[PDB]
């Protein structure tokens with residue numbers, strides 16, 4: 001769908017469902033909170049070799065495959081799409097598990113179609129799960145990958161040590177993705193709370209401090225909970241019936257208060273275990 005590419009199968013459904021041309025995703029690297037060093041790495045490894053190819057050849061040959069390792073909800077998929085937008089890269093999002101349920105005919109077309117679209121990025125989430133007869137993909141990736149090497153393959157794992165040696169080989173570069181610090185947390189809370197009616201009474205510094213072990217997904221989960229705690233704070237019987245009532249009309253005027261974060265702060269808890277972040281930090285060195 002650049003020029004001409006057609007091949008009979010009902011598989012084109014899923015592949016095009018995971019594809020995003022450089023037009024579709026208007027993503028921005030500036031729509032990410034923090035990850036300065038991670039943006040810096042992917043920028044030099046993906047964007048710059050496409051803009052200055054005379055410089056990035058020979059001893060400066062760019063990496064073809066890369067793996068992002070970190071606790072869950074740290075933004076590995078965001079940064080994958082954000083660096084594909086900055087570099088005019090056709091984006092492919094492919095979860096490892098979703099393949100095992102859906103498969104070998106997809107991976108072939110996935111790479112064949114990724115190569116068809118000039119520079120493109122194939123993102124693979126939870127590749128640690130790959131390493132029953134799912135050998136049709138858990139290895140078909142390696143033969144489609146060793147041949148495809150234009151096409152950059154970014155992979156993501158929350159369990160980086162459960163990565164077998166067969167995959168450790170193909171992904172030499174390993175970027176550790178950490179948890180947002182106190183300052184990045186604050187901007188993440190304010191970003192999630194952007195267009196939500198709330199009282200000015202809320203202080204985003206206390207929230208940034210109280211959410212120590214939180215990830216970016218935990219922060220937005222804290223925000224969704226506080227926003228809906230407004231509904232919980234309401235009298236239930238007034239909100240009953242299938243017809244619109246004045247009480248439901250009052251629900252709209254409601255602001256998110258400090259109480260709503262307080263309830264949410266006792267509800268959501270960090271999903272990034274203590275020794276689990278170091279599991280990635282040390283693995284990215286050995």
Ligand SMILES: Nc1ncnc2c1ncn2[C@@H]1O[C@H](COP(=O)(O)OP(=O)(O)O)[C@@H](O)[C@H]1O
Nearest residue numbers: 031032033034072073074075076077078216217
């Ligand atoms: N650094 C960040 N900046 C902005 N949003 C973030 C950040 N980290 C996480 N998020 C939010 O968390 C959600 C899940 O992040 P995701 O990219 O799926 O991380 P992972 O790949 O680790 O699952 C996203 O929808 C995003 O809005």
